[PDB]
Coordinates of C-alpha atoms and ligand atoms in Angstrom, one line a residue:
Chain A
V270 CA -10.1 -12.0 -17.4
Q271 CA -12.8 -10.6 -19.5
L272 CA -15.8 -8.5 -18.6
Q273 CA -18.4 -7.4 -21.2
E274 CA -21.5 -5.3 -20.3
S275 CA -24.7 -5.1 -22.3
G276 CA -28.3 -4.0 -22.0
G277 CA -28.0 -0.3 -22.0
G278 CA -30.2 1.9 -24.1
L279 CA -32.0 5.2 -24.6
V280 CA -35.1 5.4 -22.4
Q281 CA -37.6 8.0 -21.2
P282 CA -37.7 9.2 -17.7
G283 CA -39.4 6.7 -15.4
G284 CA -38.2 4.0 -17.8
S285 CA -36.2 0.9 -17.1
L286 CA -33.3 -1.2 -18.3
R287 CA -31.6 -4.5 -17.2
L288 CA -27.9 -4.4 -17.5
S289 CA -25.9 -7.6 -17.9
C290 CA -22.1 -8.3 -17.6
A291 CA -20.7 -11.6 -19.0
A292 CA -17.5 -12.7 -17.2
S293 CA -14.8 -15.2 -18.1
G294 CA -11.2 -16.1 -17.3
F295 CA -11.6 -16.2 -13.5
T296 CA -13.7 -18.0 -10.9
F297 CA -16.8 -15.7 -11.1
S298 CA -18.5 -17.5 -8.2
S299 CA -15.7 -16.4 -5.9
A300 CA -15.5 -12.7 -7.0
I301 CA -16.9 -9.6 -5.4
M302 CA -18.6 -7.6 -8.3
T303 CA -19.2 -3.9 -8.6
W304 CA -21.1 -1.6 -10.9
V305 CA -19.7 1.8 -11.5
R306 CA -20.9 4.7 -13.8
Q307 CA -19.1 7.5 -15.6
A308 CA -20.7 10.5 -17.5
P309 CA -18.6 12.9 -19.5
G310 CA -17.5 15.8 -17.4
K311 CA -18.4 14.2 -14.2
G312 CA -16.7 12.2 -11.5
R313 CA -16.7 8.4 -11.5
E314 CA -19.6 7.1 -9.3
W315 CA -19.9 3.9 -7.5
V316 CA -23.4 2.3 -8.0
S317 CA -23.5 -1.0 -6.2
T318 CA -21.5 -4.0 -5.1
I319 CA -22.4 -7.6 -4.6
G320 CA -20.6 -10.3 -2.6
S321 CA -19.6 -13.5 -4.3
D322 CA -22.6 -15.6 -3.1
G323 CA -25.1 -12.8 -3.8
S324 CA -26.3 -12.4 -0.3
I325 CA -24.6 -9.1 0.6
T326 CA -25.5 -6.1 -1.5
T327 CA -24.7 -2.5 -1.1
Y328 CA -25.9 0.6 -3.0
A329 CA -25.0 4.2 -3.5
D330 CA -27.6 6.5 -1.9
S331 CA -28.3 8.0 -5.4
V332 CA -29.8 4.7 -6.5
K333 CA -31.2 3.1 -3.4
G334 CA -34.8 1.8 -4.0
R335 CA -34.5 2.1 -7.8
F336 CA -31.7 -0.2 -8.8
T337 CA -31.1 -3.8 -7.8
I338 CA -27.9 -5.7 -8.2
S339 CA -27.8 -9.5 -8.7
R340 CA -25.8 -12.3 -10.1
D341 CA -26.2 -15.8 -11.6
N342 CA -23.0 -17.7 -10.6
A343 CA -23.9 -20.6 -12.8
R344 CA -24.1 -18.4 -15.8
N345 CA -21.1 -16.2 -15.0
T346 CA -23.4 -13.2 -15.2
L347 CA -23.8 -10.0 -13.1
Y348 CA -27.0 -8.0 -13.4
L349 CA -28.3 -4.4 -12.7
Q350 CA -32.0 -4.0 -12.8
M351 CA -32.6 -0.3 -13.3
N352 CA -36.1 1.2 -12.5
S353 CA -37.5 4.8 -12.2
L354 CA -34.7 6.1 -14.4
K355 CA -33.9 9.8 -14.4
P356 CA -31.8 12.1 -16.8
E357 CA -29.1 12.2 -14.0
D358 CA -28.6 8.5 -14.4
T359 CA -27.2 8.9 -17.9
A360 CA -23.7 7.4 -18.0
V361 CA -21.6 4.6 -19.2
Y362 CA -22.2 1.8 -16.7
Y363 CA -19.4 -0.6 -16.2
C364 CA -18.5 -3.7 -14.1
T365 CA -15.3 -3.9 -12.2
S366 CA -13.5 -6.7 -10.3
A367 CA -9.9 -7.0 -8.9
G368 CA -8.8 -3.8 -10.7
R369 CA -10.2 -4.8 -14.1
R370 CA -13.2 -3.3 -15.8
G371 CA -15.3 -4.0 -18.9
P372 CA -15.8 -1.5 -21.6
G373 CA -19.2 -0.5 -20.4
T374 CA -22.7 0.1 -21.7
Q375 CA -24.4 3.4 -22.3
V376 CA -27.5 4.4 -20.5
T377 CA -29.2 7.6 -21.7
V378 CA -32.3 8.9 -20.2
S379 CA -34.0 11.7 -22.1
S380 CA -37.5 13.2 -22.6
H381 CA -36.4 14.2 -26.2
Chain B
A191 CA -13.4 10.8 1.9
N192 CA -11.9 13.5 4.2
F193 CA -8.1 13.7 3.9
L194 CA -7.6 16.1 6.9
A195 CA -9.5 13.5 9.1
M196 CA -6.8 11.0 8.1
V197 CA -4.0 13.1 9.6
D198 CA -2.5 11.2 12.5
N199 CA -4.6 8.1 11.7
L200 CA -1.7 5.9 12.3
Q201 CA 0.0 4.7 15.6
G202 CA 3.5 3.5 15.8
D203 CA 4.8 1.5 18.8
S204 CA 8.5 2.6 18.6
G205 CA 10.4 0.5 15.9
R206 CA 7.4 -2.0 15.6
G207 CA 5.5 -0.6 12.6
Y208 CA 2.7 1.8 11.8
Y209 CA -0.9 0.6 12.1
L210 CA -4.4 1.8 11.3
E211 CA -7.6 1.2 13.3
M212 CA -10.2 -0.7 11.2
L213 CA -13.7 -1.8 12.1
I214 CA -14.8 -5.1 10.6
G215 CA -18.1 -6.9 10.4
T216 CA -21.6 -6.4 11.9
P217 CA -21.6 -5.3 14.6
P218 CA -18.1 -3.8 14.2
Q219 CA -15.0 -5.4 15.8
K220 CA -12.0 -3.0 16.0
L221 CA -8.6 -4.3 14.9
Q222 CA -5.2 -2.7 14.6
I223 CA -3.8 -3.3 11.2
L224 CA -0.2 -2.8 10.0
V225 CA 0.1 -0.6 6.9
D226 CA 2.1 -2.7 4.4
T227 CA 3.0 -1.4 0.9
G228 CA 5.0 -4.6 0.3
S229 CA 2.1 -7.1 0.2
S230 CA -1.4 -7.2 -1.2
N231 CA -3.6 -9.2 1.2
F232 CA -5.9 -7.9 4.0
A233 CA -5.3 -10.5 6.7
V234 CA -6.2 -10.5 10.4
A235 CA -5.9 -12.7 13.3
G236 CA -9.0 -15.0 13.4
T237 CA -8.1 -17.0 16.6
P238 CA -6.4 -16.2 20.0
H239 CA -2.6 -15.9 19.9
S240 CA -0.1 -15.3 22.8
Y241 CA 1.2 -12.0 21.5
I242 CA -2.2 -10.4 20.5
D243 CA -4.9 -8.9 22.7
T244 CA -7.8 -9.4 20.2
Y245 CA -8.7 -11.1 16.9
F246 CA -11.6 -11.0 14.4
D247 CA -14.3 -13.5 15.4
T248 CA -16.1 -14.3 12.3
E249 CA -18.9 -16.0 14.1
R250 CA -19.8 -12.7 15.7
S251 CA -20.4 -10.9 12.3
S252 CA -23.8 -11.3 10.7
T253 CA -22.5 -10.0 7.4
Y254 CA -19.3 -12.2 7.1
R255 CA -19.4 -14.8 4.4
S256 CA -16.8 -17.5 3.8
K257 CA -15.4 -18.1 0.3
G258 CA -14.9 -21.8 1.1
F259 CA -11.1 -21.8 0.6
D260 CA -7.9 -21.1 2.6
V261 CA -4.7 -19.3 1.7
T262 CA -1.2 -20.0 3.0
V263 CA 1.3 -17.2 2.6
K264 CA 5.0 -17.9 3.2
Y265 CA 7.7 -15.2 3.7
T266 CA 11.4 -15.6 4.3
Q267 CA 11.1 -15.3 8.1
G268 CA 7.6 -16.7 8.7
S269 CA 4.1 -17.7 7.4
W270 CA 0.4 -17.8 8.0
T271 CA -2.6 -19.7 6.8
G272 CA -6.1 -18.3 7.0
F273 CA -9.7 -18.7 5.7
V274 CA -10.7 -16.4 2.9
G275 CA -14.0 -14.5 3.4
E276 CA -15.8 -11.2 2.7
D277 CA -17.1 -8.6 5.1
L278 CA -17.9 -5.0 5.6
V279 CA -15.1 -2.7 6.7
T280 CA -15.1 0.9 8.0
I281 CA -12.0 3.1 8.5
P282 CA -13.3 5.7 11.0
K283 CA -10.4 8.2 10.6
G284 CA -11.2 9.1 7.0
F285 CA -14.5 7.6 5.8
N286 CA -18.2 7.7 6.9
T287 CA -19.4 4.5 5.3
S288 CA -18.5 0.8 5.0
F289 CA -17.1 -1.2 2.1
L290 CA -17.2 -4.8 1.1
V291 CA -13.8 -6.4 1.0
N292 CA -12.0 -9.7 0.9
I293 CA -10.5 -10.7 4.3
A294 CA -8.1 -13.5 5.3
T295 CA -8.7 -14.7 8.8
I296 CA -5.5 -16.3 10.2
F297 CA -5.8 -19.5 12.1
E298 CA -2.2 -20.7 12.1
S299 CA 1.1 -18.8 11.8
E300 CA 4.9 -19.1 12.3
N301 CA 6.9 -16.2 13.5
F302 CA 4.3 -13.6 12.4
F303 CA 2.7 -12.3 15.5
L304 CA 5.8 -11.4 17.6
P305 CA 6.0 -10.4 21.3
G306 CA 5.4 -6.7 22.1
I307 CA 3.6 -5.9 18.8
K308 CA 0.4 -3.9 18.9
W309 CA -1.2 -4.9 15.6
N310 CA -3.3 -8.0 14.9
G311 CA -3.5 -7.8 11.1
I312 CA -1.9 -6.5 8.0
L313 CA -3.2 -4.2 5.2
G314 CA -1.4 -5.0 1.9
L315 CA -1.5 -2.0 -0.3
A316 CA 0.7 -3.3 -3.2
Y317 CA -0.8 -4.4 -6.6
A318 CA -3.1 -7.3 -7.5
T319 CA -0.2 -9.1 -9.0
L320 CA 1.1 -10.0 -5.4
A321 CA -2.4 -11.1 -4.0
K322 CA -2.8 -14.7 -2.8
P323 CA -4.1 -17.2 -3.8
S324 CA -4.2 -15.2 -7.0
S325 CA -4.5 -11.8 -8.5
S326 CA -8.3 -12.3 -8.9
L327 CA -8.7 -11.8 -5.1
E328 CA -9.7 -8.2 -5.2
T329 CA -7.3 -6.2 -3.0
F330 CA -8.4 -3.8 -0.2
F331 CA -7.4 -0.7 -2.0
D332 CA -9.0 -1.8 -5.3
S333 CA -12.2 -2.3 -3.4
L334 CA -12.0 1.0 -1.6
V335 CA -11.0 3.0 -4.8
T336 CA -14.2 1.8 -6.5
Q337 CA -16.6 1.7 -3.6
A338 CA -15.5 5.0 -2.0
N339 CA -15.1 7.1 -5.2
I340 CA -11.5 8.1 -4.4
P341 CA -8.6 8.5 -6.8
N342 CA -6.2 5.6 -7.2
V343 CA -3.6 7.2 -5.0
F344 CA -2.5 7.0 -1.4
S345 CA 0.2 8.5 0.6
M346 CA 2.0 7.7 3.9
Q347 CA 3.9 9.6 6.5
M348 CA 5.8 8.1 9.4
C349 CA 6.6 10.4 12.3
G350 CA 8.2 7.9 14.8
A351 CA 11.9 9.0 14.5
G352 CA 11.0 12.5 15.8
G353 CA 2.6 8.0 14.9
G354 CA 1.8 8.8 11.2
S355 CA -0.7 9.3 8.4
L356 CA -2.2 7.1 5.7
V357 CA -4.1 9.4 3.4
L358 CA -6.3 7.1 1.3
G359 CA -7.3 8.7 -2.1
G360 CA -4.7 11.6 -2.3
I361 CA -2.2 14.0 -0.9
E362 CA -2.7 16.1 2.3
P363 CA -0.9 19.5 1.9
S364 CA -0.4 20.0 5.6
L365 CA 1.9 16.9 5.7
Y366 CA 4.8 18.4 3.7
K367 CA 6.5 21.6 2.6
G368 CA 8.5 22.1 -0.5
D369 CA 8.5 20.0 -3.6
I370 CA 7.2 16.6 -4.4
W371 CA 9.6 14.7 -6.7
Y372 CA 8.3 11.7 -8.7
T373 CA 10.1 8.6 -9.9
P374 CA 8.3 6.1 -12.2
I375 CA 7.0 2.8 -11.0
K376 CA 9.0 0.4 -13.3
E377 CA 6.9 -2.7 -12.5
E378 CA 3.5 -2.8 -10.8
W379 CA 3.7 -5.6 -8.3
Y380 CA 5.7 -4.2 -5.4
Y381 CA 6.3 -0.5 -5.7
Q382 CA 9.3 -1.1 -7.8
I383 CA 11.4 2.1 -8.6
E384 CA 14.7 2.6 -10.3
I385 CA 17.8 3.5 -8.1
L386 CA 20.5 5.3 -10.0
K387 CA 23.2 5.9 -7.4
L388 CA 24.1 5.8 -3.7
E389 CA 26.3 8.5 -2.2
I390 CA 27.8 8.4 1.3
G391 CA 29.0 11.8 2.6
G392 CA 29.0 13.2 -0.9
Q393 CA 31.0 10.2 -2.3
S394 CA 29.5 7.8 -4.8
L395 CA 29.9 4.1 -4.3
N396 CA 31.2 3.4 -7.9
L397 CA 29.0 0.4 -8.4
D398 CA 27.3 -0.4 -11.8
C399 CA 23.7 1.0 -11.2
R400 CA 22.3 -2.6 -12.0
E401 CA 23.7 -3.6 -8.5
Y402 CA 21.0 -1.3 -6.9
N403 CA 18.1 -3.0 -8.9
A404 CA 19.4 -6.5 -9.5
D405 CA 16.6 -8.4 -7.9
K406 CA 14.5 -5.2 -7.5
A407 CA 14.4 -1.9 -5.6
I408 CA 11.1 -1.3 -3.8
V409 CA 9.3 1.0 -1.4
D410 CA 8.0 -1.1 1.5
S411 CA 6.3 0.3 4.6
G412 CA 6.3 -3.3 6.0
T413 CA 10.1 -3.5 6.1
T414 CA 11.8 -2.1 9.1
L415 CA 15.3 -1.3 7.8
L416 CA 16.9 -0.1 4.6
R417 CA 17.9 -3.4 3.1
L418 CA 20.7 -3.5 0.6
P419 CA 22.0 -6.3 -1.6
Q420 CA 25.2 -7.7 0.1
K421 CA 27.6 -6.2 -2.4
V422 CA 25.9 -2.7 -2.1
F423 CA 25.6 -3.2 1.8
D424 CA 29.4 -4.0 1.9
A425 CA 30.2 -0.8 -0.1
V426 CA 27.9 1.4 2.1
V427 CA 29.6 0.1 5.3
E428 CA 33.1 0.7 3.8
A429 CA 32.0 4.2 2.9
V430 CA 30.3 5.1 6.3
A431 CA 33.4 3.7 8.2
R432 CA 35.7 5.8 5.9
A433 CA 33.7 9.0 6.3
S434 CA 32.9 8.7 9.9
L435 CA 35.0 10.7 12.3
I436 CA 34.9 8.3 15.2
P437 CA 37.9 5.8 15.6
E438 CA 36.0 2.6 14.6
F439 CA 32.8 0.6 14.5
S440 CA 32.8 -3.0 15.4
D441 CA 32.1 -5.6 12.7
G442 CA 29.2 -6.6 15.0
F443 CA 27.6 -3.1 14.7
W444 CA 27.4 -3.4 11.0
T445 CA 25.7 -6.8 11.0
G446 CA 23.4 -5.8 13.9
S447 CA 25.0 -8.2 16.5
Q448 CA 26.4 -5.3 18.6
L449 CA 25.1 -1.9 19.8
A450 CA 27.2 1.2 19.7
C451 CA 26.8 3.3 23.0
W452 CA 27.6 6.9 24.1
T453 CA 27.0 8.8 27.3
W454 CA 26.2 13.2 14.9
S455 CA 28.4 15.5 12.9
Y456 CA 30.9 12.7 12.9
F457 CA 28.6 10.4 10.7
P458 CA 27.8 10.9 7.0
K459 CA 24.6 11.6 5.2
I460 CA 23.4 8.8 2.8
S461 CA 21.7 9.8 -0.5
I462 CA 19.7 7.7 -2.8
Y463 CA 19.3 9.0 -6.4
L464 CA 16.0 8.2 -8.2
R465 CA 15.2 8.8 -11.8
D466 CA 12.8 11.6 -12.6
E467 CA 9.8 11.0 -14.9
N468 CA 12.1 12.9 -17.4
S469 CA 14.9 10.3 -17.7
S470 CA 17.7 12.8 -18.2
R471 CA 17.1 14.0 -14.6
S472 CA 17.2 12.5 -11.1
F473 CA 16.6 13.7 -7.6
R474 CA 18.0 12.5 -4.3
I475 CA 16.5 11.5 -1.1
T476 CA 18.9 12.0 1.8
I477 CA 18.8 10.6 5.3
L478 CA 20.9 12.0 8.1
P479 CA 22.7 9.7 10.7
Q480 CA 19.8 10.1 13.1
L481 CA 17.7 8.0 10.8
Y482 CA 20.2 5.1 10.3
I483 CA 22.0 5.1 13.8
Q484 CA 18.8 4.2 15.6
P485 CA 18.2 4.6 19.4
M486 CA 17.5 1.3 21.3
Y487 CA 24.6 5.4 28.2
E488 CA 22.3 5.9 25.1
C489 CA 22.8 2.9 22.7
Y490 CA 22.3 2.5 18.9
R491 CA 21.7 -0.1 16.3
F492 CA 22.6 0.2 12.6
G493 CA 19.4 0.9 10.6
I494 CA 20.7 -0.8 7.4
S495 CA 20.9 -4.6 6.7
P496 CA 22.1 -6.9 4.0
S497 CA 19.6 -8.5 1.6
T498 CA 20.0 -11.8 -0.2
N499 CA 17.3 -10.4 -2.7
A500 CA 15.9 -6.9 -3.0
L501 CA 17.0 -3.4 -2.2
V502 CA 14.2 -2.3 0.2
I503 CA 13.5 1.2 1.0
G504 CA 11.8 0.5 4.3
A505 CA 10.9 2.4 7.4
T506 CA 14.5 3.5 8.1
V507 CA 14.1 5.7 5.0
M508 CA 10.2 6.3 4.9
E509 CA 10.5 8.0 8.4
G510 CA 12.2 10.9 6.5
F511 CA 9.6 11.3 3.8
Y512 CA 6.0 11.9 2.8
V513 CA 5.7 9.1 0.2
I514 CA 3.0 9.3 -2.5
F515 CA 1.9 6.0 -4.0
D516 CA 0.4 7.4 -7.2
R517 CA -0.9 4.2 -8.8
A518 CA -3.1 6.2 -11.2
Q519 CA 0.0 7.9 -12.8
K520 CA 2.5 5.0 -12.3
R521 CA 4.8 6.9 -10.1
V522 CA 6.0 7.3 -6.5
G523 CA 6.4 10.8 -5.0
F524 CA 8.8 11.9 -2.2
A525 CA 8.7 15.1 -0.1
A526 CA 10.7 15.6 3.1
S527 CA 8.6 15.0 6.3
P528 CA 8.3 18.2 8.4
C529 CA 7.8 15.8 11.4
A530 CA 11.2 14.2 10.7
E531 CA 13.0 16.5 13.1
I532 CA 15.1 15.7 16.1
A533 CA 16.6 18.2 18.5
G534 CA 15.6 21.0 16.2
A535 CA 17.3 19.5 13.1
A536 CA 15.6 18.1 10.0
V537 CA 16.8 14.5 9.6
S538 CA 16.0 14.1 6.0
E539 CA 16.5 16.2 2.8
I540 CA 15.3 16.1 -0.8
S541 CA 16.9 17.8 -3.8
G542 CA 17.2 18.0 -7.5
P543 CA 17.6 18.0 -10.3
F544 CA 20.8 16.2 -11.2
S545 CA 22.0 14.9 -14.6
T546 CA 21.8 11.1 -15.4
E547 CA 24.1 11.4 -18.4
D548 CA 26.7 9.3 -16.5
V549 CA 24.3 6.3 -16.0
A550 CA 22.7 3.9 -18.4
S551 CA 19.1 4.3 -19.7
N552 CA 18.0 1.2 -17.8
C553 CA 19.5 0.4 -14.4
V554 CA 17.0 -2.6 -14.0
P555 CA 18.6 -5.8 -15.4
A556 CA 17.0 -6.7 -18.8
Ligands
0BK655 C1 9.6 0.1 12.1 O1 9.0 -1.3 12.4 C2 8.4 -1.9 11.3 C3 7.8 -3.2 11.5 C4 7.3 -3.8 10.4 C5 6.7 -5.2 10.4 O2 6.5 -5.8 11.5 N1 6.4 -5.7 9.2 C6 5.9 -7.0 8.9 C7 5.6 -8.0 9.8 C8 5.1 -9.2 9.4 C9 4.9 -9.5 8.1 F1 4.4 -10.7 7.7 C10 5.2 -8.5 7.1 C11 5.0 -8.8 5.6 C12 3.5 -9.1 5.3 F2 3.4 -9.5 4.0 C13 6.0 -9.9 5.2 C14 7.4 -9.4 5.1 C15 7.6 -8.4 4.0 C16 8.9 -7.6 4.3 S1 7.5 -9.2 2.3 C17 8.0 -8.0 1.0 O3 8.6 -10.1 2.3 O4 6.2 -9.6 2.0 C18 6.4 -7.4 4.2 N2 6.5 -6.2 3.5 N3 5.3 -7.6 4.7 C19 5.7 -7.3 7.5 N4 7.2 -3.1 9.2 C20 7.8 -1.9 9.1 N5 8.3 -1.3 10.2

């Protein structure tokens, strides 16, 4: 199993990013996929989950209406479209499945 | 998550296992699910069966999705085959939201749903390693940990000997008094732990400690009895017979083929020594006769059985203890259960520390 996230960056408030996660070493098309985030000094926070065929999606109340989870099973890729970003969204975002996680991608939202 | 809301979230139907109420699908269907620390799949009845009242009808759930494959699980005594899918689940006694999980819906089984049993599914809380068809099938607890933002810890108390509690995400202080002692998880599959010694009425069995771990020693809420490898079983029986102040037990009593009937001080305590996180120390979990001479003239069955494989710390022993499955820190905790009391007497004890200088550094075969 391998998970590798990308697409993070440093954005202004109201900005946007599109996170990706490349998967290998298991049947991606059969896997529930989840995005989590973790900022220093804060608790781990569930972001969103997507069922294996993509039709069932769930979101944390903190991101509802701003972030959208999606997947391309043919390309073994999970996505997180992030809009209307706020300083409080700053975190490492990571993908997790069956007790494994990727190393993550940093999202920083700052007016500076 | 609310741990106090999880207190008494298990029902136990008197020697038949502890189960949790779970709501599955949209709209929700209520099932009764056996809590099983010895397996790793979430599986439920999907069709009618003679010995269940209800099952999960996937056709009535708008959110259910089929993965397009089946799974067959075979145990020593039985088996089942089910479709593998995904659906939303709620645990009303503890959580206020739903979670997307894998679910196996059983369509055929052999010797799995038995008569007079109140559950219609199983919740496997062991590690990904054991999940079928493979470890990539995300386990229920792995889904919950992530999606519910709980720590990677759960704990279990069984109060049937004196219902019970499954605390998902931590430890509820009101369920124990005194100290929690921790033993390392040697291998993350089953909850495999290292047994150093068994003592009957204060006398050690004088077996090589490898005899206690040869296949494996595990903590399993889905096993009824304390199951001991044959050589260990034989030694226990010989020690209990020697220590017990009654004239004699039949051979049939020991094998479970005969009950002993009467119209307690005459039977020994049984202690299991577990290594502490500091390897020079151990602690002991002790059960009184009331936990292994089990009511069924009042008649009793022996609460210990032989194994052709593992040493299983099943419900016989777990009825005495609040057991912490601290996956995050690779350890299993024990504290004596306040609810494990009969006729005003505690029926379990825990104590320590004791030296391990008289045993090898590794009692697991290597
Ligand atoms: C006090 O009364 C009871 C009754 C039960 C009970 O009925 N348990 C059960 C029933 C059916 C079944 F199928 C399983 C499996 C499910 F994987 C298989 C067998 C295995 C022992 S195992 C390591 O061989 O997988 C276990 N832990 N769980 C368990 N448990 C605990 N106390």
